[PDB]
């Protein structure tokens, strides 16, 4: 109350995100405190329709989750208008197809299995998120020994397209490995999903080495 | 008045976060107004021609965003009143033409007399390519730079312990990175970072 009122600063850094299966949410920077309880309204519309205004809540004034279901393959015009007693200002408009703003759920049912009888490999199998029918997925597959302090990563160009399994090679024998994987749209337009649950597996003992040692 | 020569030595580079830029040798002076157009396309989509500006006729920066993991056909078309000619086409995946941003937040830790630990933050392109580095160091007074064997910094990492350093010395370090397989371009050197090695009474006795 002792503070001095100010007009709303033009909202900046507007960006939207469609978490898989959830309604679109847009974020922005409201600027400096105006001391006048600025009201933010997320406006959005298709060239063929005007959607319901999204009124940013009290707790989170610089964020809003729309009321309508996401419809991929159609461009939407989005912008935010800030308003208080001293003025009304609108951010710059952004136009995009939500298919390029998806943050998929991480792959699930991640399991590590021994295969080919080799003591230097471990195979990963998993179930891709349902969004795979809307976008082609690319991944980041990471692995490390149980005792390792850091994660190693499979060359992203080797996991650049939708798949549900991957064989990691050149691993140490009789060693426990932990794995994790994340995904996003293949073209890099969108957001990486959170890391999947970690899954572990143990490589076979090296028979040839045990033989050559006994000999 | 001469027809344009076939453009040669076409190459492209994708500076991290920036649009692809291609460069070529225009060749002999035609003495006529000649246009240079960078033609590019996926087998599934023809991209927008990039007309080279007047001030920089042997270069063009495309208007489309880079899509890694997809091969793209690229060539240059030179043209004046006496004829049209295209360079040999090149085909590549932009993932092998990246010049990453240098690593940042390079800091030197020492919570030792011959060991200085380095920590940094890798560019975001690390989620697209595995990174290899060139870490260089030198005494705060030396003119030339020394280099850590590149084989010891061949894959993505955000820390490195530099050993076998001289005590009672301030060192200056810098680091650059590129794709692990050597296909691409080295990033610019990071901002330099400094640190000091502590006492070694044994090394002081020998020197004094």
Swiss-Prot record, chain A:
Q: How is it modified after translation?
A: Heavily N-glycosylated. Glycosylation is required for protein stability and localization in plasma membrane but not for ligand binding.
What are the disulphide bonds in this sequence? 16-26, 54-64
So what does mutating residue 82 to G actually do? Found in patient with lung cancer; uncertain significance
| Effect of substituting residue 134 to G | Induces ligand-independent activation
Glycan-modified residues: 13, 39, 109
- What mutagenesis or variant effect is reported for residue 30 to R? Correlated with increased levels of soluble IL6RB in blood serum
Applications in industry or biotech? Answer: Two extracellular parts of IL6ST/gp130 linked to the Fc-portions of a human IgG1 antibody (sgp130Fc) inhibit IL6 trans-signaling by the IL6:IL6R complex and has no affinity of IL6 or IL6R alone. Also blocks IL11 cluster signaling through IL11R.
Q: What induces it?
A: LIF and OSM activate the type I OSM receptor while only OSM can activate the type II OSM receptor.
- Motif (WSXWS motif) positions are 192-196
Name the organs or tissues of expression: Found in all the tissues and cell lines examined. Expression not restricted to IL6 responsive cells.
Which residues does the UniProt record annotate as the domain Fibronectin type-III? Answer: 7-98, 106-206
Description of how the protein assembles with itself and partners: Component of a hexamer of two molecules each of IL6, IL6R and IL6ST; associates with the complex IL6:IL6R but does not interact with IL6. Forms heterodimers composed of LIFR and IL6ST (type I OSM receptor) which are activated by LIF and OSM. Also forms heterodimers composed of OSMR and IL6ST (type II receptor) which are activated by OSM but not by LIF. Component of a receptor complex composed of IL6ST/GP130, IL27RA/WSX1 and CNTFR which interacts with the neuroprotective peptide humanin. Interacts with HCK. Interacts with INPP5D/SHIP1. Interacts with SRC and YES.
The family line of this record is: Belongs to the type I cytokine receptor family. Type 2 subfamily.
In UniProt terms, what function does this protein have? Signal-transducing molecule. The receptor systems for IL6, LIF, OSM, CNTF, IL11, CTF1 and BSF3 can utilize IL6ST for initiating signal transmission. Binding of IL6 to IL6R induces IL6ST homodimerization and formation of a high-affinity receptor complex, which activates the intracellular JAK-MAPK and JAK-STAT3 signaling pathways. That causes phosphorylation of IL6ST tyrosine residues which in turn activates STAT3.
Record remark on domains: The WSXWS motif appears to be necessary for proper protein folding and thereby efficient intracellular transport and cell-surface receptor binding.
Disease / disorder: Hyper-IgE syndrome 4A, autosomal dominant, with recurrent infections: An immunologic disorder characterized by recurrent mainly sino-pulmonary infections associated with increased serum IgE. Some patients have onset of symptoms in early childhood and develop complications, including bronchiectasis or hemoptysis, whereas others have later onset of less severe infections. Immunologic workup usually shows normal leukocyte levels, although some patients may demonstrate alterations in lymphocyte subsets, including T cells. Hyper-IgE syndrome 4B, autosomal recessive, with recurrent infections: An immunologic disorder characterized by recurrent infections, mainly affecting the respiratory tract, skin and eye, and skeletal abnormalities including craniosynostosis and scoliosis. Immunologic workup shows increased serum IgE, intermittent eosinophilia, impaired development of certain B- and T-cell populations, as well as impaired acute-phase response. Disease onset is in early childhood.
Protein name listed in UniProt: Interleukin-6 receptor subunit beta
Protein's organism? Homo sapiens
Q: Parent protein range shown?
A: 119 to 333 of 918
């Amino acid at each position: 109350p002792g503070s001095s009122g100010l007009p709303p600063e033009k909202p900046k850094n507007l960006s939207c995100i469609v978490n898989e299966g959830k309604k679109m949410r847009c974020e922005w920077d409201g600027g400096r405190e105006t001391h006048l309880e600025t009201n933010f309204t997320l406006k959005s519309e298709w060239a063929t329709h005007k959607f319901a205004d999204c009124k940013a809540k009290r707790d989170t004034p610089t964020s809003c989750t729309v009321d309508y279901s996401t419809v991929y393959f159609v461009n939407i015009e989005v912008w935010v208008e800030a308003e208080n007693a001293l003025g009304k200002v609108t951010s710059d408009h952004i136009n995009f197809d939500p298919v390029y703003k998806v943050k998929p759920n991480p792959p699930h049912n991640l399991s590590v299995i021994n295969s080919e009888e080799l003591s230097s490999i471990l195979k990963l199998t998993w179930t891709n998120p349902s969004i795979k029918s809307v976008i082609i997925l690319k991944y980041n597959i990471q692995y490390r020994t149980k005792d390792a302090s850091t994660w190693s990563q499979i060359p992203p160009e080797d996991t650049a397209s939708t798949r549900s399994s991957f064989t990691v090679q050149d691993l140490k024998p009789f060693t426990e490995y932990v794995f994790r994987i994340r995904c996003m749209k293949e073209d890099g337009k969108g957001y990486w999903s959170d890391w999947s649950e970690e899954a572990s597996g143990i490589t076979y003992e090296d028979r040839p080495s045990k033989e050559p040692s006994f000999w």
